[PDB]
């Protein structure tokens, strides 16, 4: 329902990955794997969103729905919903 902002460190990890075109692996609440390319972060209506160009679809989704993100080049950590 109501959007809850993610932790700053979790925000930084996606921010640094998107700013230099780093591939990110998506793990949602349901448990589906979405390995695609993330461009940047767009915030609208006081809600932060992530845009992933999965085969050009450029899907947009809320940040709080992400369970964790994994990548070998960078540190792999799991966000905390508190």
């Amino acid at each position: 329902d109501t959007y809850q902002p993610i932790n700053c460190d979790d925000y930084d990890n996606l921010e640094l990955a998107c700013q230099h075109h780093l591939m990110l692996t998506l793990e949602l609440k349901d448990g589906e794997k979405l390995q695609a390319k993330a461009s940047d972060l767009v915030s609208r209506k006081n809600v932060e969103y992530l845009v992933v160009e999965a085969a050009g679809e450029t899907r947009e989704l809320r940040l709080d729905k992400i369970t964790s993100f994994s990548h070998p080049e960078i540190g792999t950590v799991v966000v905390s919903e508190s």
Partner: protein, 418 residues
């Protein structure tokens, strides 16, 4: 717990706190090291830890949450905030950020802001929709700041005579003109005590520039509100750096419909600090002061205003005259016709051990009819007519004599008439 509590915790108390929670070593006297260790153990155990500070964005892109206790001095314990967060929430220099704090990562000297939940004493979403200070329309001060306490003590005489000589309103750009020895510090203390007691809601800040450490110690004890000062032994860059922190912090508060009062001591010292830090502009006027040097202090002094939307910023600054150096007097000449209120101190009244040594005939504000009511202004005009022929030294004797037996200025006006 939070970092702020551990900053002022007594050294004996924190040792007792550390030993019970499970700290291995406490013999070392370095307070910053031991408080660093206990936070690290709390983070390992998963315990939440919080911190607070005032943001100061540097030219690189990132900033640190300085602390008012250390006079916003750079230190190892300052919380680092990444530029990504600065872009995430619309953060300007001077914002006060409180929230979860992360222990430093390997290779990072300073702690990192784990999470921010309150900025400028409000929710982060609401604080990002506050109109900028520069976009607010200034106004003349209308609501006044009464400082006439009902105690009737001897110290209240300075407050009462100040009310008669020159009223102070919310958003007043007051100026204090003082000789080298006129009991200036006593006057600031009386105002600070009067403001805190009469107007608890208004935020009070006292800024001291080129002040001896002993004066700073007693000022913090006396003044209820936040006191920030810079010692004379510090470099001129410190005086500039601390001044920016105070003014920017005040501006952010005013954007939240808050009334902020700033006491400055002194504008002359601050002008000197800006003189030696700015690059030479190629043209230097009399007294060895660069022409563009004084532009920055005027930005500080000119920020005082009564915002029409809500809130106000009151800046009362002191100036030094006939201090030997001609640099001091040319600075005062540049700030002469820039203030709403002008209060003068006379040396010849101070030498006679008559306090406060204010010059009634040469001090006053500009638009008194807005601060005072219709009836009070007429009484002030009647009193001003009587004092006007009198000399400066005898007028104060006349004032203190007739203010001694009067409890309140309203009773004084009744006694004065007929």
């Amino acid at each position: 717990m939070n970092l702020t509590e551990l900053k002022n915790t007594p050294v004996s108390e924190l040792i007792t706190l550390g030993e019970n929670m499970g700290l291995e070593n406490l013999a070392r006297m370095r307070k910053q090291d031991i408080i660093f260790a206990i936070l690290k153990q709390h983070a390992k155990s998963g315990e939440d830890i919080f911190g607070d500070g005032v943001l100061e964005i540097l030219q690189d892109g990132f900033g640190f949450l300085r602390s008012a206790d250390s006079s916003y001095l750079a230190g190892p314990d300052d919380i680092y905030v990444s530029p990504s967060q600065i872009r995430r929430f619309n953060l300007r220099t001077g914002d006060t950020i409180s929230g979860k704090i992360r222990p430093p990562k390997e290779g990072e000297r300073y702690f990192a802001l784990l999470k921010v939940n309150e900025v400028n004493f409000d929710k982060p979403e609401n604080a990002r929709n506050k109109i900028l200070f520069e976009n607010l329309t200034p106004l003349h001060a209308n609501s006044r700041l009464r400082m006439e306490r009902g105690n009737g003590s001897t110290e209240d005489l300075t407050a009462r005579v100040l009310d008669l000589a020159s009223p102070i309103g919310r958003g007043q750009r007051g100026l204090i003109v003082a000789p080298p020895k006129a009991g200036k510090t006593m006057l600031l203390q009386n105002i600070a005590q009067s403001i805190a007691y009469n107007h608890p809601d208004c935020v009070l800040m006292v800024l001291l520039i080129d002040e001896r450490p002993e004066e700073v110690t007693e000022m913090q004890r006396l003044v209820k509100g936040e006191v920030v000062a810079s010692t004379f032994d510090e470099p001129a860059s410190r005086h500039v750096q601390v001044a920016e922190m105070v003014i920017e912090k005040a501006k952010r508060l005013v954007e939240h419909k808050k009334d902020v009062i700033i006491l400055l001591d002194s504008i002359t010292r601050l002008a000197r600090a800006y003189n030696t830090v700015v690059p030479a502009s190629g043209k230097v006027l009399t007294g060895g002061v660069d022409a563009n040097a004084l532009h920055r202090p005027k930005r500080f002094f000119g920020a005082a205003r009564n915002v029409e939307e809500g809130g106000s910023l009151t800046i009362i600054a002191t100036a030094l005259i006939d201090t030997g150096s001609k640099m001091d007097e040319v600075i005062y000449e540049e700030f002469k016709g820039t203030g709403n209120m002008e209060l003068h101190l006379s040396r010849k009244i101070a030498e006679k051990r008559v306090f406060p040594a204010i010059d009634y005939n040469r001090s006053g504000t500009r638009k008194e009819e807005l601060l005072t009511t219709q009836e009070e202004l007429q009484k002030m005009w009647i009193l001003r007519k009587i004092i006007h022929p009198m000399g400066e030294i005898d007028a104060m004797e006349f004032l203190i004599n007739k203010l001694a037996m009067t409890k309140t200025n309203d009773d004084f006006f009744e006694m004065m008439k007929r």
